[PDB]
Amino acid sequence: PLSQKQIDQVRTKVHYSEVDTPFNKYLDILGKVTKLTGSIINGTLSND
Amino acid sequence: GRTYFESLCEEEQSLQESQTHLLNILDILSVLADPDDLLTESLKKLPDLHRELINSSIRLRYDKYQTREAQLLEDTKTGRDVAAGVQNPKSISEYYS
Amino acid sequence: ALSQKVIPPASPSQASILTEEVIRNWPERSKTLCSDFTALESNDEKEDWLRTLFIELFDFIDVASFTNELVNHERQVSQASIVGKMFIAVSS
């Protein structure tokens, strides 16, 4: 048994699924550098 | 961000600032990992650049959601709504009949 | 020998300028912040300030912060769009 609120909540997530591969890739490049540069400022360093 | 086209333009402008920051961060990273003093100044310039890249990125994801919402709001307008203002219905009805 | 990994430069915690002071004086400061947020015009500029606050908040991390977010969102429901929620959704 699912209430009216929960059904509306799944419907809104379905109505918005986006799969833009070009975008997700650029954000991933930004992250693969933010995690490294942020680590160096901490000074944790280490050989990967 | 009123229109789908205008929001896409704002997103493009947010992409460029992030790109310049990223390229500068990469060059400083090369100087730091290059085979002191120059390396000491770089090891500080890198935190200076860090107080910038995350803020700029923040904005890019924010605009991505902004653009998605506007596109959905525009796609809800059906054909009937747009043709509400046609000036002369008459001729249209005569021609169709 | 891969790297010295020795860092002479350092930074102290003098940040959170807009989320300033002790969290002490909690309700007075919280109401002051809510009033200041409701005060601002030119929605764009508002977004800017929000960023700072929010990242400062994630520096600390709690239920008090959740109540504060409740107040902020509820105050924002009076207007059409919801900027605070989207900005939490990114800055998280």
Curated annotation (Swiss-Prot), chain A:
Intracellular or extracellular location(s): Nucleus
Disulfide bonds: none
Assembly, per entry: Component of the THO complex, which is composed of HPR1, MFT1, THO2 and THP2. Together with SUB2, TEX1 and YRA1, THO forms the transcription/export (TREX) complex. THO associates with DNA and RNA in vitro.
Further remark: Present with 5910 molecules/cell in log phase SD medium.
Task performed by this protein: Component the THO subcomplex of the TREX complex, which operates in coupling transcription elongation to mRNA export. The THO complex is recruited to transcribed genes and moves along the gene with the elongating polymerase during transcription. THO is important for stabilizing nascent RNA in the RNA polymerase II elongation complex by preventing formation of DNA:RNA hybrids behind the elongating polymerase.
Name of the protein in its database record: THO complex subunit MFT1
This protein's encoding gene: MFT1
